[PDB]
Protein backbone atom coordinates (compact mmCIF):
# COMPACT_ATOMS: atom_id res chain seq x y z
CA UNK A 1 0.00 0.00 0.00
CA UNK A 2 2.88 2.53 0.23
CA UNK A 3 3.66 5.41 -2.11
CA UNK A 4 6.34 5.30 -4.76
CA UNK A 5 8.21 8.29 -3.48
CA UNK A 6 11.90 8.16 -2.91
CA UNK A 7 11.76 8.83 0.81
CA UNK A 8 14.91 10.98 0.71
CA UNK A 9 17.52 12.16 -1.82
CA UNK A 10 20.14 9.79 -3.20
CA UNK A 11 23.20 11.71 -2.03
CA UNK A 12 24.47 14.04 0.69
CA UNK A 13 22.04 13.00 3.41
CA UNK A 14 24.52 10.90 5.26
CA UNK A 15 21.82 8.23 5.44
CA UNK A 16 21.87 5.05 3.32
CA UNK A 17 20.33 5.18 -0.19
CA UNK A 18 16.69 4.17 -0.56
CA UNK A 19 13.72 4.11 -2.86
CA UNK A 20 10.14 3.42 -1.79
CA UNK A 21 9.49 2.03 1.62
CA UNK A 22 7.81 -0.91 -0.06
CA UNK A 23 11.30 -2.20 -0.68
CA UNK A 24 11.59 -5.67 0.99
CA UNK A 25 14.50 -4.28 2.93
CA UNK A 26 12.11 -2.12 5.00
CA UNK A 27 10.03 -3.34 7.89
CA UNK A 28 6.47 -3.54 6.61
CA UNK A 29 7.80 -3.64 3.05
CA UNK A 30 6.95 -6.33 0.54
CA UNK A 31 8.00 -9.98 0.62
CA UNK A 32 10.86 -11.15 -1.66
CA UNK A 33 9.88 -14.66 -2.64
CA UNK A 34 6.84 -15.29 -0.48
CA UNK A 35 4.14 -17.71 -1.55
CA UNK A 36 1.48 -16.82 -4.07
CA UNK A 37 -1.54 -19.01 -4.90
CA UNK A 38 -0.63 -22.29 -6.45
CA UNK A 39 -1.83 -25.52 -8.06
CA UNK A 40 -0.02 -28.42 -6.43
CA UNK A 41 -1.92 -30.96 -8.52
CA UNK A 42 -0.56 -32.96 -11.45
CA UNK A 43 -1.70 -35.76 -13.74
CA UNK A 44 -0.33 -39.08 -12.51
CA UNK A 45 -0.38 -41.77 -15.22
CA UNK A 46 -3.79 -43.47 -15.25
CA UNK A 47 -2.09 -46.84 -15.59
CA UNK A 48 -0.16 -46.15 -12.43
CA UNK A 49 -3.23 -45.13 -10.51
CA UNK A 50 -5.05 -48.33 -11.37
CA UNK A 51 -1.99 -50.53 -10.85
CA UNK A 52 -1.49 -49.25 -7.31
CA UNK A 53 -5.19 -49.55 -6.46
CA UNK A 54 -5.03 -53.19 -7.36
CA UNK A 55 -1.70 -53.37 -5.57
CA UNK A 56 -3.20 -51.88 -2.40
CA UNK A 57 -6.00 -54.44 -2.25
CA UNK A 58 -3.29 -57.05 -2.81
CA UNK A 59 -1.25 -55.95 0.21
CA UNK A 60 -4.40 -56.23 2.28
CA UNK A 61 -5.16 -59.60 0.70
CA UNK A 62 -1.80 -61.12 1.60
CA UNK A 63 -2.09 -59.82 5.14
CA UNK A 64 -5.47 -61.53 5.25
CA UNK A 65 -7.13 -58.32 6.42
CA UNK A 66 -9.44 -58.24 3.39
CA UNK A 67 -12.97 -59.55 3.84
CA UNK A 68 -15.74 -59.79 1.27
CA UNK A 69 -19.37 -59.89 2.43
CA UNK A 70 -22.41 -60.30 0.19
CA UNK A 71 -24.65 -58.31 2.51
CA UNK A 72 -24.80 -56.91 5.99
CA UNK A 73 -27.78 -58.57 7.65
CA UNK A 74 -29.04 -56.72 10.72
CA UNK A 75 -28.19 -53.19 9.59
CA UNK A 76 -31.30 -51.18 8.75
CA UNK A 77 -29.57 -47.92 9.46
CA UNK A 78 -28.56 -47.45 13.12
CA UNK A 79 -25.04 -47.54 14.52
CA UNK A 80 -25.79 -50.15 17.16
CA UNK A 81 -27.11 -52.31 14.31
CA UNK A 82 -23.74 -52.15 12.62
CA UNK A 83 -22.00 -52.76 15.91
CA UNK A 84 -24.04 -55.96 16.22
CA UNK A 85 -23.12 -57.07 12.71
CA UNK A 86 -19.49 -55.97 13.05
CA UNK A 87 -19.16 -58.12 16.16
CA UNK A 88 -20.14 -61.14 14.07
CA UNK A 89 -17.73 -60.43 11.24
CA UNK A 90 -15.12 -60.30 13.97
CA UNK A 91 -14.72 -56.55 13.58
CA UNK A 92 -14.31 -55.84 17.29
CA UNK A 93 -12.78 -52.50 16.40
CA UNK A 94 -9.33 -53.30 17.72
CA UNK A 95 -8.14 -52.28 14.25
CA UNK A 96 -9.13 -49.72 11.65
CA UNK A 97 -11.60 -50.57 8.89
CA UNK A 98 -12.23 -49.23 5.43
CA UNK A 99 -15.86 -50.06 4.70
CA UNK A 100 -16.61 -49.94 0.99
CA UNK A 101 -20.24 -50.34 -0.05
CA UNK A 102 -22.89 -48.80 -2.27
CA UNK A 103 -25.44 -49.34 0.48
CA UNK A 104 -26.44 -45.87 1.69
CA UNK A 105 -27.92 -47.21 4.90
CA UNK A 106 -24.93 -49.29 5.89
CA UNK A 107 -22.43 -46.48 5.45
CA UNK A 108 -24.76 -44.38 7.60
CA UNK A 109 -24.61 -46.97 10.35
CA UNK A 110 -20.83 -47.42 10.48
CA UNK A 111 -19.97 -43.73 9.79
CA UNK A 112 -19.70 -42.33 13.35
CA UNK A 113 -17.46 -45.11 14.62
CA UNK A 114 -13.99 -43.65 15.16
CA UNK A 115 -12.46 -46.92 13.93
CA UNK A 116 -14.40 -47.03 10.64
CA UNK A 117 -13.95 -45.19 7.36
CA UNK A 118 -16.93 -45.14 5.02
CA UNK A 119 -16.71 -45.13 1.21
CA UNK A 120 -18.76 -45.59 -1.92
CA UNK A 121 -17.28 -48.13 -4.39
CA UNK A 122 -16.49 -45.36 -6.87
CA UNK A 123 -14.51 -43.74 -4.09
CA UNK A 124 -12.01 -46.57 -3.66
CA UNK A 125 -8.54 -45.04 -3.58
CA UNK A 126 -5.13 -46.27 -2.48
CA UNK A 127 -4.55 -43.70 0.31
CA UNK A 128 -7.66 -44.65 2.23
CA UNK A 129 -6.84 -48.36 1.91
CA UNK A 130 -3.29 -48.00 3.14
CA UNK A 131 -4.21 -45.88 6.18
CA UNK A 132 -6.59 -48.59 7.43
CA UNK A 133 -5.80 -51.97 8.96
CA UNK A 134 -8.69 -53.78 7.41
CA UNK A 135 -10.50 -53.90 4.09
CA UNK A 136 -14.15 -54.90 4.01
CA UNK A 137 -16.22 -54.83 0.82
CA UNK A 138 -19.68 -55.57 -0.64
CA UNK A 139 -19.64 -58.31 -3.19
CA UNK A 140 -21.64 -55.63 -4.97
CA UNK A 141 -18.64 -53.31 -4.57
CA UNK A 142 -16.00 -55.92 -5.36
CA UNK A 143 -17.61 -55.93 -8.78
CA UNK A 144 -16.76 -52.24 -9.18
CA UNK A 145 -13.16 -52.74 -8.14
CA UNK A 146 -12.66 -55.68 -10.46
CA UNK A 147 -14.12 -53.53 -13.19
CA UNK A 148 -11.96 -50.49 -12.57
CA UNK A 149 -8.78 -52.44 -13.01
CA UNK A 150 -8.64 -54.13 -16.44
CA UNK B 1 37.64 24.83 13.63
CA UNK B 2 36.85 21.58 11.91
CA UNK B 3 34.68 19.93 14.54
CA UNK B 4 36.84 17.56 16.65
CA UNK B 5 35.08 14.31 17.58
CA UNK B 6 35.57 11.17 19.67
CA UNK B 7 37.41 8.53 17.66
CA UNK B 8 36.17 5.63 19.71
CA UNK B 9 33.41 4.99 22.25
CA UNK B 10 34.79 5.27 25.75
CA UNK B 11 35.04 1.93 27.50
CA UNK B 12 33.08 1.31 30.68
CA UNK B 13 36.39 0.90 32.43
CA UNK B 14 37.69 4.19 31.16
CA UNK B 15 34.44 6.03 31.86
CA UNK B 16 34.20 4.93 35.44
CA UNK B 17 37.92 5.51 35.87
CA UNK B 18 37.36 9.19 35.15
CA UNK B 19 34.78 9.34 37.87
CA UNK B 20 37.17 8.06 40.52
CA UNK B 21 37.14 11.61 41.79
CA UNK B 22 33.41 12.30 41.51
CA UNK B 23 32.65 10.94 45.01
CA UNK B 24 30.93 13.28 47.48
CA UNK B 25 32.21 14.47 50.88
CA UNK B 26 29.99 14.15 53.98
CA UNK B 27 29.04 17.57 55.37
CA UNK B 28 31.43 18.51 58.13
CA UNK B 29 29.46 18.98 61.36
CA UNK B 30 29.81 19.87 65.02
CA UNK B 31 27.58 19.67 68.08
CA UNK B 32 26.05 22.90 69.34
CA UNK B 33 27.25 23.76 72.86
CA UNK B 34 23.68 24.61 73.77
CA UNK B 35 21.14 22.30 72.17
CA UNK B 36 23.77 19.71 71.23
CA UNK B 37 22.13 19.44 67.80
CA UNK B 38 24.51 18.81 64.95
CA UNK B 39 25.22 21.79 62.68
CA UNK B 40 27.89 23.22 60.45
CA UNK B 41 30.71 24.94 62.39
CA UNK B 42 31.05 28.74 62.38
CA UNK B 43 27.39 29.08 61.56
CA UNK B 44 24.64 30.25 63.88
CA UNK B 45 22.68 27.25 65.15
CA UNK B 46 19.39 26.80 63.30
CA UNK B 47 17.93 24.67 66.09
CA UNK B 48 18.26 27.01 69.10
CA UNK B 49 19.48 30.24 67.49
CA UNK B 50 22.59 30.56 69.64
CA UNK B 51 26.13 31.45 68.62
CA UNK B 52 29.07 32.27 70.89
CA UNK B 53 26.94 31.81 73.98
CA UNK B 54 24.53 34.59 73.01
CA UNK B 55 21.11 34.08 71.49
CA UNK B 56 21.60 35.54 68.03
CA UNK B 57 18.34 34.91 66.29
CA UNK B 58 15.12 33.41 67.58
CA UNK B 59 14.31 29.93 66.41
CA UNK C 1 62.96 -49.20 43.29
CA UNK C 2 61.77 -47.32 40.21
CA UNK C 3 61.63 -48.20 36.53
CA UNK C 4 61.63 -46.21 33.31
CA UNK C 5 59.21 -48.01 31.00
CA UNK C 6 58.16 -47.49 27.39
CA UNK C 7 54.64 -47.84 26.02
CA UNK C 8 52.61 -46.00 23.44
CA UNK C 9 55.69 -44.35 21.99
CA UNK C 10 56.42 -42.49 25.21
CA UNK C 11 58.41 -43.14 28.42
CA UNK C 12 57.37 -42.84 32.07
CA UNK C 13 58.91 -43.30 35.49
CA UNK C 14 56.91 -45.80 37.53
CA UNK C 15 56.90 -47.15 41.11
CA UNK C 16 54.75 -50.09 42.23
CA UNK C 17 51.28 -48.78 43.04
CA UNK C 18 51.48 -45.96 40.51
CA UNK C 19 48.25 -45.13 38.79
CA UNK C 20 49.24 -44.48 35.15
CA UNK C 21 47.22 -43.31 32.18
CA UNK C 22 48.76 -44.36 28.85
CA UNK C 23 48.14 -44.81 25.14
CA UNK C 24 45.38 -47.35 24.47
CA UNK C 25 46.32 -51.02 24.78
CA UNK C 26 44.59 -54.25 23.82
CA UNK C 27 44.37 -55.94 27.21
CA UNK C 28 40.90 -56.68 28.54
CA UNK C 29 40.36 -54.71 31.77
CA UNK C 30 41.64 -56.80 34.64
CA UNK C 31 44.29 -58.40 32.39
CA UNK C 32 47.88 -57.94 33.46
CA UNK C 33 50.52 -56.90 30.98
CA UNK C 34 54.30 -56.67 31.03
CA UNK C 35 56.04 -53.46 30.03
CA UNK C 36 59.65 -53.23 28.79
CA UNK C 37 62.16 -51.68 31.15
CA UNK C 38 64.71 -49.13 30.02
CA UNK C 39 66.31 -48.39 33.37
CA UNK C 40 66.21 -49.57 37.00
CA UNK C 41 66.88 -47.15 39.80
CA UNK C 42 66.70 -46.96 43.55
CA UNK C 43 68.85 -49.47 45.38
CA UNK C 44 70.23 -51.24 42.31
CA UNK C 45 71.06 -49.09 39.32
CA UNK C 46 70.68 -51.03 36.09
CA UNK C 47 71.02 -49.14 32.81
CA UNK C 48 69.42 -50.39 29.62
CA UNK C 49 71.13 -50.43 26.23
CA UNK C 50 68.55 -49.65 25.17
CA UNK C 51 66.47 -52.24 27.03
CA UNK C 52 67.39 -54.16 30.20
CA UNK C 53 67.43 -57.89 29.33
CA UNK C 54 65.66 -59.73 32.16
CA UNK C 55 63.50 -56.89 33.45
CA UNK C 56 59.77 -56.20 33.08
CA UNK C 57 57.11 -54.15 34.80
CA UNK C 58 53.89 -55.97 35.60
CA UNK C 59 50.93 -53.64 35.31
CA UNK C 60 47.21 -54.26 35.43
CA UNK C 61 44.76 -52.57 33.11
CA UNK C 62 42.11 -50.82 35.16
CA UNK C 63 40.09 -49.78 32.13
CA UNK C 64 39.96 -47.81 28.89
CA UNK C 65 38.41 -44.43 28.26
CA UNK C 66 38.24 -41.28 26.19
CA UNK C 67 40.04 -38.21 27.46
CA UNK C 68 38.25 -34.93 27.86
CA UNK C 69 37.27 -33.34 24.55
CA UNK C 70 39.93 -31.14 23.03
CA UNK C 71 38.10 -28.75 20.74
CA UNK C 72 40.32 -28.24 17.70
CA UNK C 73 39.39 -25.18 15.65
CA UNK C 74 40.79 -23.70 12.45
CA UNK C 75 40.31 -20.20 11.00
CA UNK C 76 41.90 -18.44 8.01
CA UNK C 77 40.91 -14.81 7.55
CA UNK C 78 39.46 -12.97 4.52
CA UNK C 79 38.89 -16.33 2.92
CA UNK C 80 35.80 -17.79 4.64
CA UNK C 81 37.49 -20.81 6.17
CA UNK C 82 36.48 -22.33 9.41
CA UNK C 83 36.61 -25.85 10.75
CA UNK C 84 35.49 -27.37 14.06
CA UNK C 85 36.72 -30.78 15.14
CA UNK C 86 36.09 -32.40 18.50
CA UNK C 87 38.95 -34.60 19.57
CA UNK C 88 38.69 -37.08 22.41
CA UNK C 89 41.95 -39.02 22.74
CA UNK C 90 41.56 -42.68 23.83
CA UNK C 91 43.71 -44.17 26.61
CA UNK C 92 44.37 -47.00 29.01
CA UNK C 93 44.65 -46.83 32.82
CA UNK C 94 47.23 -49.07 34.49
CA UNK C 95 47.99 -50.00 38.07
CA UNK C 96 51.69 -50.75 38.44
CA UNK C 97 51.99 -54.01 40.35
CA UNK C 98 55.64 -54.88 40.52
CA UNK C 99 59.07 -54.56 39.05
CA UNK C 100 60.71 -57.77 37.85
CA UNK C 101 64.50 -57.64 37.60
Amino acid sequence: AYSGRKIWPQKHTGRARHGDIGAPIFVGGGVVFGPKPRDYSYTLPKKVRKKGLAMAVADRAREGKLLLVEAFAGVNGKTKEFLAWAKEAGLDGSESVLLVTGNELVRRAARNLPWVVTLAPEGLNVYDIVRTERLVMDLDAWEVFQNRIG
Amino acid sequence: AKHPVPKKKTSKARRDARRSHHALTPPILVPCPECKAMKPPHTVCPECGYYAGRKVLEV
Amino acid sequence: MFAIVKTGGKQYRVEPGLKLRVEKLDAEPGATVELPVLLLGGEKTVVGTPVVEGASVVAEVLGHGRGKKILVSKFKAKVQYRRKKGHRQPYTELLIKEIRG
Partner: protein
Amino acid sequence: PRAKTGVVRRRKHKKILKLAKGYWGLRSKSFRKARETLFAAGNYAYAHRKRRKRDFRRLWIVRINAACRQHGLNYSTFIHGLKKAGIEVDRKNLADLAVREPQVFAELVERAKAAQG
Protein backbone atom coordinates in the same frame (compact mmCIF):
# COMPACT_ATOMS: atom_id res chain seq x y z
CA PRO D 1 4.08 -21.86 5.65
CA ARG D 2 6.20 -19.15 7.29
CA ALA D 3 9.25 -20.29 9.23
CA LYS D 4 10.15 -17.23 11.29
CA THR D 5 13.64 -17.02 12.88
CA GLY D 6 12.21 -17.74 16.28
CA VAL D 7 14.36 -19.31 18.86
CA VAL D 8 17.24 -20.38 16.64
CA ARG D 9 19.48 -17.27 16.43
CA ARG D 10 19.51 -16.64 20.14
CA ARG D 11 20.50 -20.26 20.78
CA LYS D 12 23.47 -19.92 18.43
CA HIS D 13 24.40 -16.65 20.05
CA LYS D 14 24.10 -17.89 23.63
CA LYS D 15 26.18 -20.91 22.68
CA ILE D 16 29.16 -18.77 21.81
CA LEU D 17 28.91 -16.20 24.55
CA LYS D 18 29.04 -19.23 26.80
CA LEU D 19 32.45 -19.98 25.35
CA ALA D 20 33.61 -16.45 25.69
CA LYS D 21 33.06 -16.18 29.44
CA GLY D 22 36.04 -14.53 31.09
CA TYR D 23 36.90 -12.44 28.03
CA TRP D 24 37.48 -8.72 28.53
CA GLY D 25 34.68 -6.23 28.21
CA LEU D 26 32.71 -6.64 25.02
CA ARG D 27 34.62 -9.80 24.06
CA SER D 28 32.43 -11.53 26.59
CA LYS D 29 29.33 -9.42 26.23
CA SER D 30 28.99 -8.85 22.47
CA PHE D 31 28.31 -11.90 20.31
CA ARG D 32 30.20 -10.40 17.42
CA LYS D 33 33.24 -9.56 19.50
CA ALA D 34 32.95 -12.89 21.27
CA ARG D 35 33.05 -14.74 18.00
CA GLU D 36 36.02 -12.83 16.66
CA THR D 37 37.96 -13.41 19.85
CA LEU D 38 37.09 -17.07 19.80
CA PHE D 39 38.45 -17.47 16.26
CA ALA D 40 41.83 -16.31 17.48
CA ALA D 41 41.68 -18.37 20.63
CA GLY D 42 41.03 -21.53 18.66
CA ASN D 43 44.02 -20.89 16.43
CA TYR D 44 46.28 -20.01 19.33
CA ALA D 45 45.41 -23.34 20.99
CA TYR D 46 46.05 -25.36 17.87
CA ALA D 47 49.39 -23.73 17.25
CA HIS D 48 50.36 -23.63 20.93
CA ARG D 49 49.66 -27.34 21.41
CA LYS D 50 52.38 -27.84 18.82
CA ARG D 51 54.66 -25.30 20.52
CA ARG D 52 54.11 -26.74 23.95
CA LYS D 53 56.05 -29.74 22.83
CA ARG D 54 59.05 -27.70 21.64
CA ASP D 55 58.93 -25.63 24.79
CA PHE D 56 59.26 -28.59 27.11
CA ARG D 57 62.08 -30.16 25.08
CA ARG D 58 63.90 -26.87 25.52
CA LEU D 59 63.23 -26.83 29.24
CA TRP D 60 64.39 -30.40 29.68
CA ILE D 61 67.44 -29.70 27.56
CA VAL D 62 68.41 -26.67 29.64
CA ARG D 63 68.26 -28.75 32.78
CA ILE D 64 70.11 -31.81 31.43
CA ASN D 65 72.78 -29.33 30.39
CA ALA D 66 73.02 -27.76 33.84
CA ALA D 67 73.29 -31.18 35.46
CA CYS D 68 75.89 -32.15 32.91
CA ARG D 69 78.28 -29.36 33.57
CA GLN D 70 78.35 -30.27 37.23
CA HIS D 71 80.28 -33.34 36.06
CA GLY D 72 82.35 -31.10 33.84
CA LEU D 73 80.93 -31.79 30.41
CA ASN D 74 78.34 -30.11 28.15
CA TYR D 75 75.01 -31.51 26.95
CA SER D 76 76.52 -31.57 23.46
CA THR D 77 78.88 -34.47 24.03
CA PHE D 78 76.68 -36.01 26.76
CA ILE D 79 73.94 -36.75 24.33
CA HIS D 80 76.47 -38.07 21.89
CA GLY D 81 78.02 -40.46 24.40
CA LEU D 82 74.55 -41.56 25.40
CA LYS D 83 73.86 -42.39 21.77
CA LYS D 84 77.06 -44.26 20.96
CA ALA D 85 76.35 -46.30 24.07
CA GLY D 86 72.88 -47.31 22.83
CA ILE D 87 70.93 -45.61 25.62
CA GLU D 88 67.38 -44.62 24.63
CA VAL D 89 66.17 -42.77 27.72
CA ASP D 90 64.49 -39.55 26.57
CA ARG D 91 64.95 -35.98 27.73
CA LYS D 92 61.77 -35.75 29.75
CA ASN D 93 63.19 -38.59 31.82
CA LEU D 94 66.83 -37.57 31.63
CA ALA D 95 65.86 -34.25 33.16
CA ASP D 96 63.67 -35.78 35.84
CA LEU D 97 66.60 -38.04 36.75
CA ALA D 98 69.07 -35.17 36.73
CA VAL D 99 67.03 -33.68 39.55
CA ARG D 100 65.39 -36.56 41.43
CA GLU D 101 68.06 -39.23 41.00
CA PRO D 102 71.51 -37.52 40.98
CA GLN D 103 73.43 -40.74 41.57
CA VAL D 104 71.76 -42.35 38.52
CA PHE D 105 72.25 -39.35 36.28
CA ALA D 106 75.83 -39.27 37.51
CA GLU D 107 76.19 -42.82 36.31
CA LEU D 108 74.77 -42.08 32.89
CA VAL D 109 77.47 -39.41 32.71
CA GLU D 110 80.27 -41.94 33.20
CA ARG D 111 78.75 -44.20 30.56
CA ALA D 112 78.52 -41.48 27.95
CA LYS D 113 82.09 -40.48 28.68
CA ALA D 114 83.21 -44.06 28.33
CA ALA D 115 81.66 -44.72 24.95
CA GLN D 116 82.99 -41.89 22.72
CA GLY D 117 86.79 -42.26 23.08
